[PDB]
């Protein structure tokens, strides 16, 4: 079964997704982000001291 | 007890007549599972 | 044969698939416990039992 | 007694079925609180 949701990008927020699929009882899926990283790619120009 | 010949009784404190075909048919047809005892 | 009166048929699940993908429940009141034979009077639905 | 395979019983005088998963989970679910005995 395919499902798509959108969860906010905030650390610690408890997000809950509801899946309703015919023939079955609904499912609640909880999923939250515990940390995030964001690394740029770096080109070294020079070194100074 | 003392139900119709075509059926039995499956309780002592409580009365519950079940057909003889339900006696030892592989399923618990009574509140107390004494249909599937000592088959 | 046990006597049945006030029969109501309500459908729990319904998916028009290849197997038995539909469920219906029957509410009734009977005088005595026994065995009854179910049937469906249209070819639009096929009963498993 | 002799409830659904999924659910176990928690009484002798009373009829009250509970899911197996409720058995020994740190909180009572039956009047005779034997869900949390012999863990
Ligand atoms: Ca039986
Ligand atoms: Ca418990």
DSSP character for B27?
S
Which ligand number lies closest to the CA of residue D2? 1
By the 8 A CB rule, do D32 and D10 touch? yes
Resolution in A: 3.0
Q: What is the DSSP letter of C30?
A: E
Backbone angles phi, psi at B9, to 5 degrees: -115, 135
- Nearest to residue A21, comparing CAs of C11, C15, C24? C15
Closest ligand to C-alpha of residue D10 is: 2
Tokens 């790619």 belong to A41
Contact C34 B19 (CB under 8 A): yes
Q: Distance, CA D6 to ligand 2 centroid (Å)?
A: 15
Separation CA C31–CA B20 (nearest Å)? 18
Which chain D residue's Cα is nearest to B32? D1
Buried b (16+ CB within 10 A) or exposed e, A6-26: eeeeeeeeeeeeeeeeeeeee
- Distance between Cα D15 and ligand 2 center (Å): 16
Three-class secondary structure of residue D22 per DSSP: helix
Chains C and D contact (Cβ–Cβ under 8 Å for 3 or more pairs): no
Measure the CA–CA gap between B37 and D38, rounded to whole angstroms: 27
């Amino acid at each position: 079964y395919e499902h798509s949701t959108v969860m906010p990008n905030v650390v610690g927020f408890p997000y809950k997704a509801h899946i309703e699929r015919p023939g079955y009882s609904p499912l609640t899926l909880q999923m939250q982000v515990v940390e995030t990283s964001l690394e740029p790619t770096l080109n070294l120009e020079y070194i100074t001291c | 007890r003392t139900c119709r010949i075509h059926e039995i009784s499956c309780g002592a404190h409580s009365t519950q007549c079940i057909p003889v075909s339900w006696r030892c048919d592989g399923e618990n047809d009574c509140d107390s599972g004494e249909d599937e005892e000592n088959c | 044969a046990p006597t049945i009166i006030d029969l109501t048929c309500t459908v729990a699940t319904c998916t028009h698939s290849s197997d038995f993908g539909g469920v219906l429940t029957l509410t009734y009141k009977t005088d005595k416990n026994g065995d009854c034979s179910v049937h469906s009077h249209s070819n639009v639905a096929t009963l498993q039992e």
